[PDB]
Amino acid sequence: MLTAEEKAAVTAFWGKVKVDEVGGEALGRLLVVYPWTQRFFESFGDLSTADAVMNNPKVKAHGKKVLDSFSNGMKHLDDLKGTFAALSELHCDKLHVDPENFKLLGNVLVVVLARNFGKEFTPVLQADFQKVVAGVANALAHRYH
Amino acid sequence: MLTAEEKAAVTAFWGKVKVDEVGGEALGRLLVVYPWTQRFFESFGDLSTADAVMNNPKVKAHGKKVLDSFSNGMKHLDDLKGTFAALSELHCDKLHVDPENFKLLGNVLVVVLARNFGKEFTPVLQADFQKVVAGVANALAHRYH
Amino acid sequence: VLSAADKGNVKAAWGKVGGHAAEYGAEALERMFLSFPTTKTYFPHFDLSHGSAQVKGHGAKVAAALTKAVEHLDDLPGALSELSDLHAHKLRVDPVNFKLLSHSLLVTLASHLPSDFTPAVHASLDKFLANVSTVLTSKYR
Amino acid sequence: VLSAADKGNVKAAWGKVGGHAAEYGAEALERMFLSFPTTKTYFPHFDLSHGSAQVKGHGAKVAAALTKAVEHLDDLPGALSELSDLHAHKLRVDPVNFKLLSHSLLVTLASHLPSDFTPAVHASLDKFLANVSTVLTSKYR
Ligand code: HEM
Ligand code: HEM
Ligand code: HEM
Ligand code: HEM
């Protein structure tokens, strides 16, 4: 989507992300800030308080999983659609996940990166990531019917 | 975005719309239902009431103008982007029109089509138009920077 | 905030719907499912085919709720307290979906009441539906 | 609806912003302009260059309004009445733009207070901003 310099910037920045950590953090924050998203993770156990969510080992593991998958996309910024085609299909037909959730997670992801990288997460860098999370959300929404 | 079939169905239906009448109504309803849209048409005159807006000769003239352009788009369903690229630019650089407005107008237009065609404006038809309106709003917002 | 005039328009327009309310609710649902396929993610255990009993049954409940709301325009929050708790604590439908059903309903009213669906009624209905949506999602967090 | 807990969280977090409010205001705006360029259509006569006095000046006014919001957490509508009037009758900024500024502000706060921006505070600020947004567009129609 982005330019060759923007691609270079995002790539380089991403190489610094501690994916298990940022993953668990992002997923955990999503369940706390937008509690209705909890509807899909009832099996995860206790999600009643912020602490319960954030310390939940399954929220943790799942966050890791989602972000490893996201990282895969970071390697295919040119074909996000092809990359997430199988997963779009899965989220729709088997998990029945409203794609609106993908935007919510994308936005939470951006806040987490800002919290974790402080001043390094510049307004320009943020702009690049907004384009990415939007691109990913759209790729995942793509095979819905 | 539309299939050959959807295109065919939409094209065939479009040939029954009385563009002038529908255009003035659509623009008029937009100014009445979402009054903040009035911000760009101060020069049109009196917009204080539902009646002032609906009978305003400028609203009507402008409504037609927008709808003719829309009709032009209907003849180029395969390249909405190319067709509206210059208009996109113009709306951004000279008019300073928030692209969100294009979304509001697309929705009001589907409501106006329904009100004018009653039962002929079927659930399937409507679905097709929802796609059209969306693709147009997107082509018009595509050169914002 | 529904003005005096808004309330009058809603009551009058709902009045014209009359007995077809159940019918319009089912059509709104169907229009919503074809137009915005993502809304179907909330009805996995439903038969969403054209004319399904499930869809007609649900449309009638939706409409019945709206009918209730219209009778208690001066207290939507009380009128809708249990559907509020139900959407918030059990269904947990993402808020954007309310906009989609609303639109779908307006299109339905428009196609069935061409003469009563004036610009001013359109505007009051749009506001009413938004208000209803706001009340249904008020206990989400 | 702000809970008692939300109100303590907002007061605490805003307390930590303290003297930097104006600065964070200017930075949230700058982030908004870059990530969501359509927001620029409302500032056609602004020098939007990085560091402009205009953006800094505007950033400070937005921040002072928020500070006033934080002080009257039990009367947002009364505390922000003049600003509702202004946005509703003159500015007429489409409601979607409020979510874009809220997000940008959230991003700014997180980068500046990493240790204080806990999941719970995040959730409370998000709700506070949503409530500020709602108040600001409540007179639109
Ligand atoms: C937006 C970026 C996302 C990516 C890349 C992603 C990716 C994945 C992957 C790789 C899996 C495992 C698939 C499998 O079991 O074969 C998965 C499962 C799942 N995802 Fe997504 N996901 C994303 C967002 C979301 C969101 C926002 C939600 C809902 C709030 C969600 C709900 C689920 C659920 C419920 C599962 C199945 C969990 C289980 O094993 O029980 N995902 N996702
Ligand atoms: C979505 C479909 C739309 C299309 C195809 C469209 C197309 C056009 C065209 C062809 C013109 C005239 C260009 C010229 O020769 O100067 C125009 C002008 C304009 N449009 Fe759009 N438009 C659309 C929507 C909107 C919306 C939603 C708004 C704002 C509510 C808007 C605001 C304006 C204004 C203010 C002008 C200038 C009128 C004048 O000369 O005073 N347009 N548009
Ligand atoms: C005007 C807006 C709405 C009203 C008045 C409304 C009202 C209702 C009512 C009265 C029920 C049935 C309670 C029962 O019989 O137990 C219900 C259930 C339900 N609603 Fe809502 N609703 C609205 C919007 C939505 C939206 C936008 C969605 C999602 C797209 C939705 C999804 C559901 C689901 C999935 C159920 C349960 C269906 C079942 O399995 O029987 N609702 N709603
Ligand atoms: C938390 C949300 C917001 C708050 C607290 C806020 C507050 C304010 C304040 C305090 C002013 C200055 C009034 C004066 O001149 O004395 C203002 C003006 C203005 N705001 Fe809002 N605002 C918010 C959201 C927005 C958004 C989202 C936009 C557009 C994206 C916007 C666009 C404007 C514009 C264009 C002006 C007038 C600036 C000028 O030309 O001098 N505001 N706002």
| Ordered DSSP codes for A24-67 | HHHHHHHHHHSGGGGGG-GGG---SSHHHHHH-HHHHHHHHHHH
User: What is the rounded CA–CA span in Å between residue C133 and residue B18?
Assistant: 34
Tokens of C73: 């325009």
Under CATH, which number does the domain D1-141 receive?
A: 1.10.490.10
- Burial readout C8-40 (b: 16 or more C-beta within 10 A, e: otherwise): ebbeebbeebeeebbbbbbbbbbbbbbbbebbb
- Torsion angles phi and psi, residue D23, rounded to 5: -65, -45
In order of A114, A116, B47, C127, D98, the CA distances from D110 in angstroms are 6, 8, 44, 35, 18
Structural tokens at position C13: 């327009």
Residue in D with minimal Cα distance to B36: D92
- Does the beta carbon of C69 sit less than 6 angstroms from any atom of ligand 3? no
Look up residue B109 and give its two tokens: 């237009």
Structure tokens at C77: 């929050």
Per the listing, tokens 């970071």 go with A74
- Span from the CA of B107 to the centroid of ligand 2 (angstroms): 16
**Distance in Å, alpha carbon of D89 to nearest chain A alpha carbon:** 31
Are C11 and C103 a contacting pair, CB within 8 Å? no
**Please, how many CA atoms are within 13 Å of residue B134, restricted to the half-sphere of its CB?**
10
* Whole-number Å distance between alpha carbons of A65 and A57: 12
What does DSSP assign to residue C45? T
Q: How far is A137 from chain C (nearest CA, A)?
A: 13
Place of tokens 């006095």: D53
Could you tell me which chain C residue has the CA closest to the CA of B124? C34
Question: What is the rounded CA–CA span in Å between residue D25 and residue D21?
Answer: 6
Angle value at C-alpha D24, between D85 and D28, nearest 5 degrees = 65
Q: Please give the distance, rounded to the nearest whole angstrom, from the Cα atom of residue D25 to the centre of ligand 4.
A: 11
Check pocket membership of C91 for ligand 3, CB cut-off 6 A.
Answer: yes
Q: Kindly state the tokens that stand for A91.
A: 């989220």
Ligand 4, atom 31: closest residue by C-alpha? D93
B/D touch flag: 3 or more CB pairs below 8 Å: yes
How far is C4 from C2, CA to CA, in rounded Å? 7
CA distance B131 to B10: 10
**Nearest by Cα to B20 from B60, B57, B49, B58:** B60
Residue A124 vs residues A4, A10, A117, B47, D34: alpha-carbon distances, Å: 15, 10, 14, 41, 7
The domain that contains B61 carries what CATH number?
A: 1.10.490.10
Dist CA A124 CA B141 (whole Å): 21
Tokens 């969306």 sit on residue: B134
Residues with CB under 6 A from ligand 4: D 39, 42-43, 61-62, 65-66, 83, 91, 93, 97-98, 101, 132, 136
Q: Which residue has the tokens 């989602």?
A: A66
Measured between its terminal Cα atoms, the distance across chain C in Å is 22
The residue of chain C with its CA nearest to that of D6 is: C141
Residue D58 annotated as binding site: yes
Binding-site sequence positions of A for heme b: 62, 91
Could you list the residues of B known to form a binding site for heme b, using ranges.
62, 91
Q: What's the total number of domains in chain A?
A: 1
Those residues with Cβ within 8 angstroms of residue B49's Cβ, 6 or more apart along the chain or in another chain: none
Q: Which of A39, A118, B34, A64 minimizes the C-alpha distance to C92?
A: A39
Q: How many CA atoms lie within 13 A of D86 on its CB side?
A: 5
- The DSSP 8-state label assigned to residue D105 in this structure reads H
Q: Tell me if B86 CB under 6 Å of ligand 2.
A: no
Tell if the CB–CB gap between B145 and D37 is shorter than 8 Å: yes
* Contact A35/C at CB under 8 A: yes
- Give the other-Cβ count within 10 Å of D67's Cβ: 15
How crowded is residue A72: how many other Cβ atoms within 10 Å of its Cβ?
Answer: 12
Radius of gyration of chain C (CA): 14
Q: Determine contact, residues D106/D129, Cβ cutoff 8 Å.
A: yes
Q: What is the DSSP letter of B40?
A: G
Task: Give, in order, the Cα–Cα distances in Å from C75 to each of C1, C78, C93, C129.
Answer: 12, 6, 23, 14
Say which experimental method was used. X-ray
Q: How many CB atoms lie within 10 A of CB D25?
A: 26
The SS3 of residue C61 is helix
Contacts of C88 in chain A (CB under 8 A): 36
Query: C105 CB under 6 A from ligand 3?
Result: no
A31 Cβ below 6 A of ligand 1 = no
| Domain with B24 in it | 1-145
* D119–chain C Cβ distance below 8 A for any pair: no
- CA gap B96, D39 in Å, rounded: 10
**Tokens at D28, concatenated:** 């949230």
Contact B32 C106 (CB under 8 A): no
Residues of C numbered 87-106 whose beta carbons fall under 8 angstroms of chain A's beta carbons: which are they? 88, 92-94, 96-97
For residue C38, what is the nearest residue in chain A, using CA coordinates? A98
If you write DSSP's letter for every residue of D29-96 in order, what string do you get?
HHHHHHH-GGGGGG-TTS--STT-HHHHHHHHHHHHHHHHHHHTTT-HHHHTHHHHHHIIIII---TH
D121 Cα–ligand 4 center, Å: 25
> How many other C-beta atoms lie within 10 A of the C-beta of residue A15?
8
Ligand 2 centre distance from Cα of residue C115 (Å): 29
Cα(D133)–Cα(D98) distance, integer angstroms: 6
Return d(Cα C85, Cα B136) in angstroms, integer: 39
Among D1, D123, D138, the residue with its CB nearest the CB of C1 is D138
Helical H runs in chain B? 4-14, 19-33, 50-55, 57-74, 80-90, 100-117, 123-141
What tokens appear for D39 in the block?
Answer: 């927001």
How are the residues of chain D apportioned to helix, strand and coil, as percentages rounded to the nearest 5?
75, 0, 25
**C18: enclosing H helix or E strand:** none
Q: Are D37 and B144 in contact (CB under 8 A)?
A: yes
Q: What single-letter amino acid sits at B140?
A: L
Query: Which chain A positions have a beta carbon within 8 Å of D100's beta carbon?
Result: none
Cβ-defined contact of A145 to C92 (cutoff 8 Å): no
